Amino acid sequence: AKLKNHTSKNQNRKDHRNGIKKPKKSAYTSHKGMCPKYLRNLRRSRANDPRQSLRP
Amino acid sequence: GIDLKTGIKKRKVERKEPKSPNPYIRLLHNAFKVVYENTGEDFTKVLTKRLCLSKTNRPVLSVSRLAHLMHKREDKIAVVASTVTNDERLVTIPRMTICALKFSATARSRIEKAGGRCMSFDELLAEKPTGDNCVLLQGRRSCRAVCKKFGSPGRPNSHVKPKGEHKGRRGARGRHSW
Amino acid sequence: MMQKYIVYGRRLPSEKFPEPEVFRMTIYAPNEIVAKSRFWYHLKSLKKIKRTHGEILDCQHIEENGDFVKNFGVLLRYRSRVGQHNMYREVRETTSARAMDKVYSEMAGQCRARYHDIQIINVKEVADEDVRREKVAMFTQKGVRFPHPCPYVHVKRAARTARFQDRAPHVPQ
Amino acid sequence: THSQGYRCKTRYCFARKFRRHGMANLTTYNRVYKLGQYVNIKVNGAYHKGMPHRYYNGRTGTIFNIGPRALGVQIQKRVRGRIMLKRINVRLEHVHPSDCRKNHLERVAANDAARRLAGQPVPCLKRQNALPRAAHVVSIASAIDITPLKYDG
Amino acid sequence: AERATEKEKRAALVKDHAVKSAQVYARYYIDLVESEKKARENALKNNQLYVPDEPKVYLVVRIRGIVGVAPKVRTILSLLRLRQINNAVFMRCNKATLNALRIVDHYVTYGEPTVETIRNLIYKRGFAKVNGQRIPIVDNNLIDEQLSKHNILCAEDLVHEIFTCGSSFKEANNFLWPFQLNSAALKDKRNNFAEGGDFGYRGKYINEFVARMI
RNA sequence: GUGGGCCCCUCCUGGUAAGCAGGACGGGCGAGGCGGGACGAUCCGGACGCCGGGCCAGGGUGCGCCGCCGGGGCCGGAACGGCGUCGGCCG
Ligand SMILES: [K+]
Ligand SMILES: [K+]
Ligand SMILES: [K+]
Ligand SMILES: [K+]
Ligand SMILES: [K+]
Ligand SMILES: [K+]
Ligand SMILES: [Mg+2]
Ligand SMILES: [Mg+2]
Ligand SMILES: [Mg+2]
Ligand SMILES: [Mg+2]
Ligand SMILES: [Mg+2]
Numbered sequence: 001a002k003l004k005n006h007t008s009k010n011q012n013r014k015d016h017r018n019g020i021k022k023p024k025k026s027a028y029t030s031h032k033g034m035c036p037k038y039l040r041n042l043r044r045s046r047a048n049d050p051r052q053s054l055r056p
Numbered sequence: 057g058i059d060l061k062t063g064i065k066k067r068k069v070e071r072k073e074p075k076s077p078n079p080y081i082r083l084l085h086n087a088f089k090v091v092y093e094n095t096g097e098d099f100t101k102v103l104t105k106r107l108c109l110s111k112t113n114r115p116v117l118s119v120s121r122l123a124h125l126m127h128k129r130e131d132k133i134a135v136v137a138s139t140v141t142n143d144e145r146l147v148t149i150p151r152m153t154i155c156a157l158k159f160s161a162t163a164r165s166r167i168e169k170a171g172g173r174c175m176s177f178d179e180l181l182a183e184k185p186t187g188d189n190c191v192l193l194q195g196r197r198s199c200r201a202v203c204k205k206f207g208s209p210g211r212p213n214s215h216v217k218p219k220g221e222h223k224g225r226r227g228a229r230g231r232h233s234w
Numbered sequence: 235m236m237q238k239y240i241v242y243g244r245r246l247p248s249e250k251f252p253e254p255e256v257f258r259m260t261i262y263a264p265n266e267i268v269a270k271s272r273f274w275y276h277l278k279s280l281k282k283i284k285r286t287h288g289e290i291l292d293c294q295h296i297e298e299n300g301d302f303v304k305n306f307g308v309l310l311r312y313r314s315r316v317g318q319h320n321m322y323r324e325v326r327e328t329t330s331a332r333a334m335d336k337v338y339s340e341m342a343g344q345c346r347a348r349y350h351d352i353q354i355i356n357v358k359e360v361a362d363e364d365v366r367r368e369k370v371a372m373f374t375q376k377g378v379r380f381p382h383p384c385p386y387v388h389v390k391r392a393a394r395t396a397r398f399q400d401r402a403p404h405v406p407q
Numbered sequence: 408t409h410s411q412g413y414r415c416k417t418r419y420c421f422a423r424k425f426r427r428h429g430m431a432n433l434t435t436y437n438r439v440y441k442l443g444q445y446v447n448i449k450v451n452g453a454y455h456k457g458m459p460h461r462y463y464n465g466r467t468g469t470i471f472n473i474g475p476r477a478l479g480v481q482i483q484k485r486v487r488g489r490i491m492l493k494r495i496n497v498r499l500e501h502v503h504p505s506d507c508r509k510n511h512l513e514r515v516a517a518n519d520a521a522r523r524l525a526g527q528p529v530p531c532l533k534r535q536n537a538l539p540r541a542a543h544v545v546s547i548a549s550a551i552d553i554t555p556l557k558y559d560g
Numbered sequence: 561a562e563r564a565t566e567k568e569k570r571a572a573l574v575k576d577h578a579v580k581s582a583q584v585y586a587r588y589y590i591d592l593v594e595s596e597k598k599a600r601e602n603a604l605k606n607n608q609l610y611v612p613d614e615p616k617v618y619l620v621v622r623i624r625g626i627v628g629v630a631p632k633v634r635t636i637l638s639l640l641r642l643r644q645i646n647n648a649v650f651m652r653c654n655k656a657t658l659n660a661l662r663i664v665d666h667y668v669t670y671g672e673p674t675v676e677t678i679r680n681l682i683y684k685r686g687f688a689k690v691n692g693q694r695i696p697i698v699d700n701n702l703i704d705e706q707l708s709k710h711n712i713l714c715a716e717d718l719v720h721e722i723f724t725c726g727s728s729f730k731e732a733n734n735f736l737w738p739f740q741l742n743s744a745a746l747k748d749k750r751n752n753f754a755e756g757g758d759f760g761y762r763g764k765y766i767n768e769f770v771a772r773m774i
Numbered sequence: 775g776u777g778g779g780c781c782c783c784u785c786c787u788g789g790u791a792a793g794c795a796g797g798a799c800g801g802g803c804g805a806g807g808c809g810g811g812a813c814g815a816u817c818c819g820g821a822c823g824c825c826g827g828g829c830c831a832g833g834g835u836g837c838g839c840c841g842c843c844g845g846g847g848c849c850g851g852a853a854c855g856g857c858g859u860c861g862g863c864c865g
Contacts, residue, residue: 005779006797013800014488018632021489033479033494034472057626057645057821062638241548257552264756267763271754280553280695291545291609311558318558321862336846343847344861350755353555394843537655539614542599548607625831627821628801645820645831743829749819773829 071108081107084177091185099187106137106192114138115195119163120146122154133190135180138204142166155180155190236262236331236338237297242271242291245283256291257281264355266293276353298329305365305374307335309356312347324370330357337396381407417461419465421452428453431500438504444470445505448481448497457498478502575604578714585720589675600751615672616725618651619681619740619766621773623749623759624667636664641738648681648739650722652729665752666730671766675723680774682719687737694737707735741773 031039048053074081074155085107103233117136119142124136126151136156142163149166155175159167164174184190207216210227227234239261245254257277263269270293274285307324323340327333334357341347365371372378389403414421431451440446448463457477462484472479477496484493518532598610603610604734622642641649651657651670657676661670686697690706697703697715704713710728712718721732751757753765762769 002795004796008798011487018488020485023483023490023492027492028481035474038473059626059629059634059638059643062634242550244545256545257553258547265765267761267765268754273520276553278553280555289540289611291547291611309557311555318560319863322556323862339846340861341847346848352551355555355557395560398549507713535654539616539653542612543607544609545611546606546608623831625820627806627819630800743831745829747832751832 071110072107084181087181088177088185091181095096095186097186099190099192100185102192103135103161103187106194109137111215112200113197115197115199116141117195118143119149119166121195122152122193123150126152126191131189133175133180133184135187135190135192136194137177137192138195154168235264236334237265237269238296238331239263239266239269240292240294240296241269242294243277243288244274244291245281245288257271260357262331262357266295269293298331300328302326304333305360305362305370306330307356307358307360307366308333308337308354310337310352310354312341312345312352314345314347322366324360324367326370326373333357413427413460420461420464421450423452435499438499440470440473440478440504442470445507446470446478446483446502447505448480448501451500454498454500457496459495459497459501463495465509472496472539479545570704571701574700574713578700578716581714581720582716585716614653615720616653616728617672618653618661618670619648619673619677619770620651620661620668620670621648621744621766621770622646622667623669623744623746627756629667633664633667636660639668640664641669643738644740646741646743646773648741649738650678650733652725665761666750669753669759669762669766669769671762671764671769672765673770674767675719677767677770677774678719678723681739681770682715682736683720684774685739685741686715687740688735689737707732741770744769744773 047055071181074085076082085104088100088104089099090109092104109199111234112135117142122134122136122140123146126132130150130152134152134154136154138156139158140154140156140163141160149170149172150169151171153173153175154167155177157177159174167174180190205216205219207214209216209218212231222228225233238259241261242256242258244256245251247254259273259276261269261272263272270290272289272301277288278284303326305324305326307322309320309322311318311320323337325333325336325340327336334354338349338352341352360366362371362374363373385405385407393399393403408415422523431454446468448459448466450458450461450464463482466482468480468482470478471481471494474496477498480495480497480502482493482495483490485491514534521530521532588696596610599610602608614647620642622637622645622672625645637643640651641647648674651661655679661668682697688695688697688702688706690702695702700714703715703718707713707718707728710731712721712728712732719730720726726732746758748755749759750756752760753762754760
């Protein structure tokens with residue numbers, strides 16, 4: 001009629017069993033959420049740099 | 057009792073062998089494995105590993121991509137452990153020396169009529185078994201349509217399309233669409 | 235089994251304390267490791283210096299001459315299941331270490347107090363006129379005689395191997 | 408629990424320190440920040456706009472975005488078997504410049520400084536964890552003799 | 561080939577070095593104890609003491625098994641390389657290692673060994689880790705080939721480095737597989753040595769403890 | 775495949791309490807052979823291929839039933855009573 005409600009008894013062991021993972025190396029440098037005005041200026045400067053540009 | 061659990065991981069399984077029923081593949085594999093054993097030469101090592109792949113890990117290479125890749129190093133021998141196909145959208149082909157598992161008939165005719173050579177891997181293993189002035193090349197392993205559906209379309213950071221046909225709108229018109 | 239050690243120790247020196255003081259104690263211990271542990275016990279409780287904050291300078295071990303029988307009076311404190319108490323005991327032994335074994339066995343037997351339950355304040359030799367307990371001062375006299383207090387023990391011990399015999403042995407007294 | 412509003416369980420951590428109520432001092436706005444810098448998160452309970460959730464109080468992170476009014480901070484947060492890189496937007500009253508690499512910059516500068524200053528032999532520059540102490544001499548001309556005392560009760 | 565010649569010349573030079581180092585090392589081993597005796601006598605002629613050097617190396621023996629261990633304890637033991645109940649290792653002394661080992665005292669007994677204990681352990685029970693393999697240490701041919709970079713060419717060089725805790729202590733120590741000793745004799749596995757039990761710091765009694773196990 | 779768990783050690787909540795009911799880090803049984811705790815899924819040791827030799831953990835050593843001697847003492851349960859016996863502290 002009544003069963004158990006809650007435990008976290010085995011959960012820290014399950015959490016450790018494969019090691020604690022780390023997020024990908026490129027999420028630290030994702031542009032997402034940065035200022036768009038800064039991102040615009042970045043694109044202009046590289047686009048007009050003759051050593052950095054990739055225009056054909 | 058001994059504790060061999062902490063600080064140690066589960067061992068790993070990789071293909072140490074091709075599972076093709078093809079005698080040509082088996083013979084080329086044993087031969088290049090011997091050459092590796094006796095000379096070192098990570099070139100022969102990588103070639104021996106590549107001859108064991110599973111044909112979704114061995115995409116094709118086209119003559120046009122090869123010409124672009126071998127530009128301004130036209131004197132080197134391109135080595136491809138896969139099939140070379142043709143590209144009719146390239147009107148003129150340059151002269152190249154290519155070695156491949158298989159050639160298509162139209163690719164062979166275009167390469168020869170340009171003036172280049174079509175080699176096999178036994179030809180390669182006779183003239184040069186350790187890859188001096190050879191370049192190993194491969195195609196786009198993630199060009200398959202199957203690998204474009206892996207994931208969770210519906211999760212807000214997916215960028216992957218669903219699988220069948222979906223005629224509705226719920227969750228398909230962006231965020232704030234559920 | 236007890237052995238006599240003198241332990242010298244001190245606080246580890248700092249800028250306010252060029253040459254801190256030196257403390258020495260006499261310890262009765264089964265061996266050197268227990269002796270230094272007990273020195274750190276006392277100098278922690280009394281001079282507020284833990285093992286972490288100081289260094290033991292030496293643990294000298296002393297051997298002692300025997301061959302003559304002396305009186306030792308031992309002033310101690312122990313702990314029971316209702317509190318703590320002070321006690322005096324006197325023993326007749328040859329050396330201080332042996333006297334301290336006798337004390338420890340008698341506490342284990344009659345008080346059921348163990349070794350780490352007991353702190354020894356004083357141990358000193360007591361002159362014959364100076365004695366104050368009967369079971370000691372009895373034997374501090376000239377011409378003490380008694381018949382053997384347990385001569386059955388020899389007979390039983392021999393029987394342990396002479397399991398069967400042809401008569402019940404006597405007990406000579 | 409039975410209730411988990413945004414500011415549940417904040418009776419003490421968000422309260423202001425004794426005799427430290429009122430407006431913040433103006434270094435809070437005269438400090439200069441840069442991309443890539445390290446910061447600690449500490450919630451000031453008098454300033455309500457751009458105030459991070461309670462989980463982020465007492466953590467250290469790196470600036471990813473410099474904005475007109477708020478800063479963007481990346482925090483590694485453990486979730487149930489993995490680490491996640493969380494990104495938050497926090498106003499100036501809740502951030503302080505962190506000193507987590509101060510010691511490292513000091514040591515790098517000192518290493519190069521002593522290499523330049525070399526005395527002809529180059530000293531060992533690796534940190535050495537406390538060794539066992541060497542042999543030496545102590546006088547014992549003035550020992551103090553102590554003993555256990557008697558129980559007094 | 562050139563291999564037989566070079567092999568023989570190498571071995572000959574190693575042997576010459578072996579005798580040289582043996583006699584010098586014996587001299588040094590003799591002469592320390594006189595040094596400290598004279599220092600104590602100079603101390604005693606004043607009202608002064610001599611305080612000698614503290615232990616730089618420990619010998620460490622596991623004494624409890626693998627059922628029921630806690631995570632931090634078993635991580636510390638794994639890094640100590642103590643995975644089986646009667647295994648033993650040498651260890652360096654500094655604040656990091658000492659503070660790690662105090663956490664697992666109730667699983668271990670440890671102390672500071674003599675040069676005689678070190679010699680007996682290596683000569684009776686010496687095996688080497690080579691390419692992940694456990695290879696018997698029976699001659700000086702296999703120490704020169706592995707440890708010559710670090711200027712250790714003989715068994716007596718290995719003994720001397722492990723006793724003095726020298727510059728290549730890490731490499732000399734990790735070259736040895738953990739020692740696989742016979743089963744121990746105990747009083748009270750669940751009590752400290754300073755309470756009459758057997759785990760923990762036992763000082764210079766580790767030598768008698770492991771003599772019967774070597 | 776699983777989404778009925780349970781027990782121990784420490785820390786807690788309701789209840790007079792419960793081999794009662796509800797939570798927490800770590801460990802165990804579940805899904806762990808062997809020896810010991812007379813007897814017990816979980817306690818004390820130790821966690822396992824088939825054998826021969828040796829060393830011995832936990833518990834013990836009158837006979838059942840494998841294994842001992844020497845030495846120093848004494849001779850389930852509450853409030854509350856005892857000039858039983860041995861030891862102390864204060865006057
Ligand atoms: K789908
Ligand atoms: K969460
Ligand atoms: K009730
Ligand atoms: K199991
Ligand atoms: K189990
Ligand atoms: K009584
Ligand atoms: Mg995980
Ligand atoms: Mg083994
Ligand atoms: Mg129940
Ligand atoms: Mg049974
Ligand atoms: Mg029998």
